[PDB]
Amino acid sequence: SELDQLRQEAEQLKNQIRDARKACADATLSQITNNIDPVGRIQMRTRRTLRGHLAKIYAMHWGTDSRLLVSASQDGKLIIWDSYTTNKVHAIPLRSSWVMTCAYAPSGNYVACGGLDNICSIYNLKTREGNVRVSRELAGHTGYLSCCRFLDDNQIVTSSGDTTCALWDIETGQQTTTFTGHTGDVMSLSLAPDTRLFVSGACDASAKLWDVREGMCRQTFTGHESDINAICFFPNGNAFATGSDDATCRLFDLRADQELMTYSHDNIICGITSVSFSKSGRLLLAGYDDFNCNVWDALKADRAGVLAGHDNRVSCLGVTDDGMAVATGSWDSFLKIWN
């Protein structure tokens, strides 16, 4: 029986990896930061309501210009909003009702979405002929599209319920690189700032870091007890945060190769749906199925403030690149912009 020898070999390596880490764990972030001043009470208010989706909002994403954002809804539409005014730039009725995610390309020239179609559809918002049209349907995944993010106009990374991720050449419409490893549905991904790596989070309760060029899983972070729903990179590219059904967020460091911090409180019992940092990394904003978004001191683990202005699950959020603003999208059908 050959499988005998390989499972114990996997344990001796499981332990070896724990050991190298246990050895690095000489202090804690909480101890190292215990001296610096608290952020104080963060009391942001809602500066905009975005009204126009007819049912649950499932996903949102900001344009690099810190002004336009796309949201994706149960109503079967993408809406591209101009936050500054509240005006709608486009209402995109989709071919499939079952959309779950959406992405805005860095250039502003395209947007992407997908869901239970198992397809990542790329919408061209600058057709020679002044129209908005599907310019590509990236078919390949054998499960539902759970997240997606452009690297550039010709490249995009997607996570799926088939447990995989992939990089696509949009013109070719093929998977250039596939990323296998996860054992549960993948829920989210975040591109590193250099876009040479990206992290994923899956229902196997773990996050993986991937090399975009090599197509290999470099490191794999555990600790969470239930599904990881959300993930994002700390602004320097050397760490990342996750939110989970276990009612905790966690911060993992790449180089130290382990968890530095847990954000929870005995009151908060609902699951986290979404996470993102302020421009400086100091704040970690996270959305809950309890209808609030909690603001955390990423360095001390203090709850610094609550954003409470939705009447159903907060399903998504995002912080502008310019750092001026936080967008929350909810099952109640509204997005709010907070500041």
Partner: protein, 61 residues
């Protein structure tokens, strides 16, 4: 699962191989990074309302 346990072994071979840093250095850099970029974070350091689109900015381009 014949093959399945084999790539799992060699994947750990890769994972266990990278050289690491102490947490103190890791946390030190995060803390340092924040502190360097605190002045430029509008959710920490408020900007004049007249430059904030979501409060009192009037001209836009």
């Amino acid at each position: 699962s014949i093959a399945q346990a084999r790539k799992l072994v060699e994947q750990l071979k890769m994972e266990a191989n990278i050289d690491r840093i102490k947490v103190s250095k890791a946390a030190a850099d995060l803390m340092a990074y924040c502190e360097a970029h605190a002045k430029e974070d509008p959710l920490l350091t408020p900007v004049p309302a007249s430059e904030n689109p979501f409060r009192e900015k009037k001209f836009f381009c």
